Amino acid sequence: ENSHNKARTSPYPGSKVERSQVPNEKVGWLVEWQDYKPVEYTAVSVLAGPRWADPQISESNFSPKFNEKDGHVERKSKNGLYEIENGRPRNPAGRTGLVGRGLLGRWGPNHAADPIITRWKRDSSGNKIMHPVSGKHILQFVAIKRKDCGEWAIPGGMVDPGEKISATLKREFGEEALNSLQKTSAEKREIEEKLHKLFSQDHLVIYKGYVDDPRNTDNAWMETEAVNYHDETGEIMDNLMLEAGDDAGKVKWVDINDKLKLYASHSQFIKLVAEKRDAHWSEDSEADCHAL
Numbered sequence: 001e002n003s004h005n006k007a008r009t010s011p012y013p014g015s016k017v018e019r020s021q022v023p024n025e026k027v028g029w030l031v032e033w034q035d036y037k038p039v040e041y042t043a044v045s046v047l048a049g050p051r052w053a054d055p056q057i058s059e060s061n062f063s064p065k066f067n068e069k070d071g072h073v074e075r076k077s078k079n080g081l082y083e084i085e086n087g088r089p090r091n092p093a094g095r096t097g098l099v100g101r102g103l104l105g106r107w108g109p110n111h112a113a114d115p116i117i118t119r120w121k122r123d124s125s126g127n128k129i130m131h132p133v134s135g136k137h138i139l140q141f142v143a144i145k146r147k148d149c150g151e152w153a154i155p156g157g158m159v160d161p162g163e164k165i166s167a168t169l170k171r172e173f174g175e176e177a178l179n180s181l182q183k184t185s186a187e188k189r190e191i192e193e194k195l196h197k198l199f200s201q202d203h204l205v206i207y208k209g210y211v212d213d214p215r216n217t218d219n220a221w222m223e224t225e226a227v228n229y230h231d232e233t234g235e236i237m238d239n240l241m242l243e244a245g246d247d248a249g250k251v252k253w254v255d256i257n258d259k260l261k262l263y264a265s266h267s268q269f270i271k272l273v274a275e276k277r278d279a280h281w282s283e284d285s286e287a288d289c290h291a292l
């Protein structure tokens with residue numbers, strides 16, 4: 001039922017490295033493939049050993065505790081246990097044609113968080129807006145357009161070592177969508193005040209676990225936790241100006257519907273939020289295909 005596909009594209013991000021070909025029937029690790037010969041690649045930046053990266057497996061003093069909280073490094077996958085073979089993790093979604101870590105710092109799961117902040121779209125009078133096709137109100141969420149992607153996306157990022165997911169969600173939203181890193185500390189508190197209120201009133205976990213990402217390898221992969229914080233009355237997000245963080249091209253409130261084109265698997269997350277919030281989704285019924 002559909003193997004990961006982005007995790008098998010070439011060349012590997014930021015390189016000219018080509019992955020070994022993996023036929024769809026041979027994606028699952030359960031499938032025997034004695035001749036499987038993935039290319040080995042770990043980015044120079046990762047091999048250099050920065051603070052956010054693990055050492056190579058051979059590193060004498062390195063004894064990772066996979067599938068567990070390993071000190072300041074969360075090695076548990078949100079999709080359950082992952083196998084350890086040849087002393088290293090095996091991607092839970094299957095073969096990718098490349099071993100090593102590529103651009104990912106950690107062996108195993110590399111955690112990210114995606115805060116989906118939503119509010120109902122409102123008119124000049126502060127009332128919700130009903131869509132005629134669905135009869136449901138239009139919901140909006142805060143999206144950013146990165147300069148490196150030029151694609152609209154949920155404002156998320158990597159969990160920092162020793163940081164809790166709830167903290168990552170709040171930090172990323174503030175830094176990326178409210179440009180909090182460029183605030184006078186005084187405003188950083190009016191923000192943490194509004195976000196404190198927001199991040200405690202109406203939240204739902206939308207998705208947790210593996211994400212098909214082109215940075216994934218046989219031994220390291222991305223995982224995210226997408227969580228929706230919703231402002232039902234609009235009173236929390238009404239007087240909060242959006243301002244793109246240094247690494248977000250633009251930021252804006254985006255109307256949600258099934259025509260929305262988003263980065264990665266963010267459109268699927270948004271569809272789930274619309275479902276849970278009873279928001280408008282179907283833009284075109286395709287009824288004219290029978291309308292006569």
Ligand SMILES: OC[C@H]1O[C@@H](O)[C@H](O)[C@@H](O)[C@@H]1O
Pocket residue numbers: 112113114153154155156157158211212213222223224264
């Ligand atoms: O692709 C999975 C995740 O990767 C992270 O680097 C991004 O910041 C997230 O928005 C994305 O959901």
